[PDB]
Symmetry: C3
Subunit: 238 residues, 3 copies
C-alpha cells in the first residue's frame, strides 16, 4: 500500500463512508415495512450498499488490492471490486426484474449473463498477457450489451402483465442503469486495468462516483416510489 | 502440517468422524420420506453435516490450513472453516425460516446478512495487519447480531400465519442457534485468529464441539419433530 | 504454457470453438420463444455452453492452468474445468429436474450433491499429497453415484405427476447423462490428475469430446423436443 495504492485512498475512504451511511439509511427506512413485496425490495436494496461497503473497506485497508504483472510492470489491481459486483449487480437486476414481475426464465438469463460479465471482467483484470486482457473485456462487454438488450425488449407488457399499472419507476431505474453501467467498460478500458491513459487515482474516483450513484442513488429512487408496494392496481402511498 | 497444525489433529479427526456418521444417519433417516415439505428439511439438514464432513477432512489432511503473517509471526489459519460456514450457516437459517414459512424478503435478508458475516470473518482471518483483524470481527459480529434479531422479531405470528399450530420446535431450534452461534465470535476473538489467549489446539476442540452441536445436534432435534410434515393443522407423527 | 500446456492446445481450441458456436446457435434458437416454461429451458441450456466457452478459452490462453506438486514433480492442472462444472453441472441437473417438475427438496439435494462432487474433485485436483488425491476422488464419486441414483429412483410418476404425458425426452436425456458423466471419473483417475497412465494431451481430448456431448449434444436433444413447452397434456410442436 506504499507505491501500489495510496493517492486514491481519499476516494476509497469517501466510497466506504457513502456506502456505509447509505446502508444505515435504507436499514432505518425498512423498519416497519410489513408489506411482503415491499420487504423484498428493501432486503435486496439494503444489501447492495452493505456489500459494497465491505469491499470498499477491503480496498481502503489494502486487502482487496493485488499486483498484476503485464506490459512489463507491476500493475496495482483492485480485485475487490469484482467480488463486490459479483453479488451487487445481480441483486440490482433482481430489483428491476421483480418490479415488472419478470418470468423465471428471464431472471435466470439476466443473472447468468451478469455472472459471465463479472467473471470475465475479473479474468481480464488478472490476465498476465496484455493483449489478451482486452479479449476478456470484449466478451464481458457483450454480456453487458446482452443484459441492456433484455431490459429494453421482451421485458414489459401493459396489457395487464408486466407494466400495466405503475411502470414509471421501472422506466426511470432502467434509464439510470443503462447509463451508469455503460460507463464501467469505458473507465476500465482507459484506466489501470486497460490502456492506462487515466491514472489509477482518477480511475478510483470515477468508479466511486459511478458505484454510489448505481447503488445509493438507484436505491433512493426505488425505495421512495410506491411501485414497491403495488403492481396490480393499488399504489399504497402511505 | 509439522509445526503449523498437529496437536489439534485429534479434534479434527473426531470432528470428521462425527460429521460423517451424522450425514450417514440423516441419509438413512430420509429414506422413504415422500412428504414434499419433509423432503426439504431432510435435504437441507443432511447436506449440512455432509459439507462440514468435507471441510473437516480438508483441515485434517492439511489442505484447509494456511499460514497468515501478523503480529510478527506465521499464524496457522484454518481457512477451510469459512468455506464450510459459507454454505452451512445459510442452510441452517433456511431450516428455521422454512419452518415458520418466512417471507421471501426475510429469507433474502437472513441469507445476505449471513454471507456478510462469513465473508468478513474470512477477511479478518486472512488480514495481515493485526489491529484491522478486529475491525472485520466487529462487522461480522454486527451481521450476526442482525441475524439473531430477525429470528426473534418480525418472524412469527400465531394468528394463522407463521407460528399458528406447531411452533414449539422453532422455539427450541432458535434457542440452540442463538446460544451456539454467539459462542463462535468469542472463540475466534480469544483464539489463534484473534488475541491468541487460547492455543490453536483448544480453539479447534471448541469449534469441533460447537459445530457438531449446531449441525448434528440441531439436525437430530429438527428431523425428529413432527413440524417438518405439517404446519397448518396436521402433526403427521407416523 | 511452454512445457506445462501446449500439445493439448488443439483440443482446447476446438473445445472453445464448438462451445462458442453452440452458444450462438441456442441463442438464435431461443429468439421468439414467448412460452414461460420454454423460456426456462432455453436460458439454462444456453448458459451452459456459454460458461464452458469462457473456461475453455481460459485454458487455451493459459489462465486456467496451474502447476501442482505431487509424485515429486510439477503436474499441469487445469483448474478452470472445475470453475466451469461448478455452474454447468447443476444447471444441466436443473434441466432434467424441471422437465419432471421435481420437488424443491429433490432439487436442493441434487444441487448440493453436485456442489460436493465438484468441490471435492477440485480439492483432489490441487492436493499436494498423491495418495490423498484419490481419497477426494472416492468422495466425489460417491456424490456422483448419489446423483445418478436420484435420477433413476423417486424422480418420476405417471399417475399424473412427474412423468404422466411426455417423459420420453427425460428418459433420453437421462440415458446420456448417466453414460457421459460416469466417464469423467474414469478419465480423471487415469489422466494427469490421477495415475498418469494417459498423457494430458489425450486427457484433454477426452474431456473435450465428453463436454461438447454433455453440453451441446445434450442441449440439441432437449431444445428440439416438445417437452419444453407442455407437460400436462399439450405437446405444442409449432
Ligand atoms: C455497484 C456496481 C455496479 C452497478 C457495477 C457494474 C459493473 C459493470 C457494468 C461492469 C462491466 C465491465 C465490462 C462490460 C467489461 C470489462 C470490465 C467491467 C468489469 C468493468
Ligand atoms: C456449522 C457451523 C456453524 C453453525 C457456524 C457458525 C458461525 C458463526 C456464527 C461465526 C461468526 C463469526 C463472527 C460473528 C465474527 C468473526 C468470526 C466468526 C467467523 C467466527
Ligand atoms: C459440462 C460438463 C459436465 C457435464 C461435467 C461433469 C463432470 C463430472 C461428472 C465429474 C465428476 C468427477 C468425479 C466423480 C470424481 C473426481 C473427479 C471429477 C471432478 C472428474
Ligand atoms: C455499513 C454497515 C455495515 C453492515 C454490517 C452488517 C450488515 C448486514 C446487512 C444486511 C442487509 C439486508 C437486510
Ligand atoms: C420474488 C420471488 C423470487 C424467486 C427467486 C428469484 C431468484 C433471483 C436470483 C438472484 C441472484 C442472487 C445473487
Ligand atoms: C460529480 C457530481 C456530484 C453530484 C452529487 C449529486 C447529489 C444529489 C443529491 C440529491 C438532490 C435532490 C434534489
Ligand atoms: C460422510 C459422507 C460423505 C458424503 C459424500 C457425498 C455426499 C452427498 C450428500 C448429499 C446430501 C443431501 C441429499
Ligand atoms: C421452500 C421454497 C424455497 C424457495 C427458495 C428459497 C431460497 C433460500 C436460499 C438459501 C441459501 C442457499 C445457500
Ligand atoms: C462437552 C460435553 C459433551 C456432551 C455430549 C452430549 C451428547 C448428547 C447425547 C444425547 C443424550 C439424550 C438423552
Ligand atoms: C441467456 C443465457 C446466456 C447468456 C450469455 C451471455 C454471453 C456473453 C458472451 C458469450 C460468448 C459466446 C460464445
Ligand atoms: C422452475 C422454478 C424454479 C425455482 C428455483 C429452482 C432453483 C434451482 C437451483 C439451480 C442451481 C443454480 C446453479
Ligand atoms: C469421436 C466421434 C465423433 C462423433 C461426432 C458426432 C456428431 C453428431 C452429429 C449429429 C448427426 C445426426 C444424424
Ligand atoms: C460516527 C459513527 C456514526 C454511527 C452511526 C450511528 C447511528 C445509526 C443510525 C442511523 C440513522
Ligand atoms: C485468440 C482469440 C480467441 C478467440 C476469441 C473469441 C472472442 C469473441 C469476442 C466477442 C465478439
Ligand atoms: C426521476 C428520477 C431522477 C433520476 C436522476 C436524478 C439526478 C438528480 C440530480 C439533482 C441535480
Ligand atoms: C458512448 C460514446 C462514446 C464516447 C467516446 C469514448 C472514447 C473514450 C476513449 C478516449 C480516447
Ligand atoms: C468403517 C466404515 C463404516 C462405513 C459405514 C457403512 C454403513 C453405512 C450405513 C449407515 C447406517
Ligand atoms: C479505520 C476504520 C475504518 C472505519 C470502519 C467502520 C467500522 C464499523 C464497525 C461496526 C460498528
Ligand atoms: C428440547 C430439545 C433439547 C435441546 C438441548 C439438548 C441437550 C441434551 C443433553 C442431554 C444431557
Ligand atoms: C456472553 C457473556 C460474556 C462472558 C465474558 C466473556 C469474556 C471472554 C474473554 C476472557 C478475557
Ligand atoms: C468468424 C466469427 C463468426 C462470428 C459469428 C457471427 C454470426 C452470429 C450469428 C449466428 C447464427
Ligand atoms: C485417512 C482417511 C480418512 C477417512 C476418509 C473417509 C473416506 C470415505 C470414502 C467414501 C466411502
Ligand atoms: C434419441 C436421441 C439420441 C441420443 C444419442 C445420439 C447419438 C447420435 C449420433 C449419430 C451417429
Ligand atoms: C464401467 C466399466 C469399467 C471398464 C474398466 C475401466 C478400467 C480403466 C482402467 C484401465 C487400467
Ligand atoms: C485523522 C482522522 C482520519 C479520518 C476519520 C474519518 C472517518 C470517516
Ligand atoms: C462522517 C459523516 C457522516 C455522514 C452522515 C450522513 C449525512 C446525511
Ligand atoms: C447461474 C450463473 C452461473 C455463474 C457462472 C459463472 C460465469 C463465469
Ligand atoms: C437500438 C440500439 C442502438 C445501438 C446501441 C448500442 C450499440 C452497441
Ligand atoms: C430513454 C431513451 C434512451 C436514449 C439514449 C441515448 C443513447 C446514446
Ligand atoms: C429517454 C432517452 C433515453 C436515453 C438513453 C441513453 C443512451 C446511452
Ligand atoms: C469501447 C466501447 C465501444 C463503443 C460502445 C458504444 C458507444 C456508446
Ligand atoms: C483531473 C480531475 C478529474 C475530474 C473528475 C471529476 C469527478 C466528478
Ligand atoms: C492407526 C489408525 C488411525 C485411526 C483410524 C480411525 C478411523 C476413524
Ligand atoms: C468409528 C466409530 C463409528 C461410529 C458409529 C456411530 C455410533 C452411533
Ligand atoms: C461479502 C458478502 C457476499 C455477498 C453474498 C450475497 C448474498 C445474496
Ligand atoms: C433485548 C436484547 C438484550 C441485548 C442482547 C445482545 C446485546 C448485543
Ligand atoms: C428464551 C429466553 C432467552 C434468554 C437468554 C439469556 C441471555 C443471556
Ligand atoms: C428461554 C430463555 C432464553 C435464553 C437465551 C440465551 C441468551 C444468550
Ligand atoms: C466480544 C463480545 C462482546 C460482548 C457481546 C454480548 C455478550 C453476551
Ligand atoms: C484445557 C482443556 C480445555 C477444556 C475443553 C473442554 C471440552 C468440552
Ligand atoms: C493462424 C490462425 C489460427 C487459427 C484461428 C482460428 C479461429 C478458430
Ligand atoms: C470456424 C468454424 C465456424 C463454425 C460454424 C458452425 C458450423 C455449423
Ligand atoms: C463443498 C460443497 C459446497 C456446498 C455448496 C452448497 C450447495 C447448496
Ligand atoms: C442397479 C444398479 C447397478 C449398479 C450400478 C453402479 C455400481 C456402482
Ligand atoms: C436404460 C437402461 C440402462 C442400462 C445401462 C447399462 C449399464 C452398464
Ligand atoms: C436402456 C439401457 C440403459 C443403459 C445405461 C448404461 C449404464 C452405464
Ligand atoms: C474407478 C471406478 C470404479 C468402478 C465403477 C463402476 C463401473 C461401471
Ligand atoms: C491415441 C489416440 C486416442 C484416441 C482418442 C479418440 C477420440 C475420439
Ligand atoms: C495424438 C492425439 C490423438 C488424437 C487422434 C485423433 C482424434 C479424433
Ligand atoms: C450517499 C449518502 C446516502 C444517503 C442518502 C440520503
Ligand atoms: C431514527 C430516525 C427514524 C426515521 C423515521 C422515518
Ligand atoms: C471471495 C474472494 C475472492 C478474491 C478474488 C481474487
Ligand atoms: C470470492 C472470491 C472473489 C475474488 C476472485 C478472485
Ligand atoms: C457467481 C454468481 C452466482 C450466481 C448465483 C445465482
Ligand atoms: C463499450 C461498450 C459501450 C456500450 C454503450 C451502451
Ligand atoms: C471531492 C468530491 C467527491 C464527490 C464525488 C462525486
Ligand atoms: C454425532 C453423532 C451423530 C449421530 C447421532 C445419532
Ligand atoms: C439400516 C437401518 C435402517 C433404519 C430404519 C429406521
Ligand atoms: C472455494 C475454496 C476457497 C478457499 C479460501 C481461501
Ligand atoms: C470457495 C473458496 C473459499 C475460500 C475463501 C478464501
Ligand atoms: C456466498 C454465498 C452466496 C449466497 C447465495 C444465496
Ligand atoms: C461478541 C458478541 C456476542 C453476542 C451475544 C449474543
Ligand atoms: C475427548 C472427548 C471429545 C468430545 C467433545 C465434546
Ligand atoms: C458443436 C456444434 C454445435 C452446433 C450444433 C448444431
Ligand atoms: C439467423 C438465422 C435464423 C434462424 C431461424 C430459425
Ligand atoms: C473463481 C475462480 C476460482 C479459481 C480456482 C483455483
Ligand atoms: C471461483 C473460483 C473457482 C476456482 C477454485 C480454485
Ligand atoms: C458452489 C455452488 C453453489 C450452489 C448454489 C445453489
Ligand atoms: C468410477 C465410478 C463409475 C460409476 C459407474 C456408473
Ligand atoms: C480431430 C477430431 C476432433 C473431434 C473430437 C470428437
Amino acid at each position: 500500500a506504499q507505491i501500489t495504492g495510496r493517492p486514491e485512498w481519499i476516494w476509497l475512504a469517501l466510497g466506504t463512508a457513502l456506502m456505509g451511511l447509505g446502508t444505515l439509511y435504507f436499514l432505518v427506512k425498512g423498519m416497519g415495512v410489513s408489506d411482503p413485496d415491499a420487504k423484498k425490495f428493501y432486503a435486496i436494496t439494503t444489501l447492495v450498499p452493505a456489500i459494497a461497503f465491505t469491499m470498499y473497506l477491503s480496498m481502503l485497508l489494502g486487502y482487496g488490492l493485488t499486483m498484476v504483472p503485464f506490459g512489463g510492470e507491476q500493475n496495482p489491481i483492485y480485485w475487490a471490486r469484482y467480488a463486490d459486483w459479483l453479488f451487487t449487480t445481480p441483486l440490482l437486476l433482481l430489483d428491476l426484474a421483480l418490479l415488472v414481475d419478470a418470468d423465471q426464465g428471464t431472471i435466470l438469463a439476466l443473472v447468468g449473463a451478469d455472472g459471465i460479465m463479472i467473471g470475465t471482467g475479473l479474468v481480464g483484470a488478472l490476465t498476465k498477457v496484455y493483449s489478451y486482457r482486452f479479449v476478456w473485456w470484449a466478451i464481458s462487454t457483450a454480456a453487458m450489451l446482452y443484459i441492456l438488450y433484455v431490459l429494453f425488449f421482451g421485458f414489459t407488457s401493459k396489457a395487464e402483465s408486466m407494466r400495466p399499472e405503475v411502470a414509471s419507476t421501472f422506466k426511470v431505474l432502467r434509464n439510470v442503469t443503462v447509463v451508469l453501467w455503460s460507463a464501467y467498460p469505458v473507465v476500465w478500458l482507459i484506466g489501470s486495468e486497460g490502456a492506462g491513459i487515466v491514472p489509477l487515482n482518477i480511475e478510483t474516483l470515477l468508479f466511486m462516483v459511478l458505484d454510489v450513484s448505481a447503488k445509493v442513488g438507484f436505491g433512493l429512487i426505488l425505495l421512495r416510489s410506491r411501485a414497491i408496494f403495488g403492481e396490480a392496481e393499488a399504489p399504497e402511498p402511505s
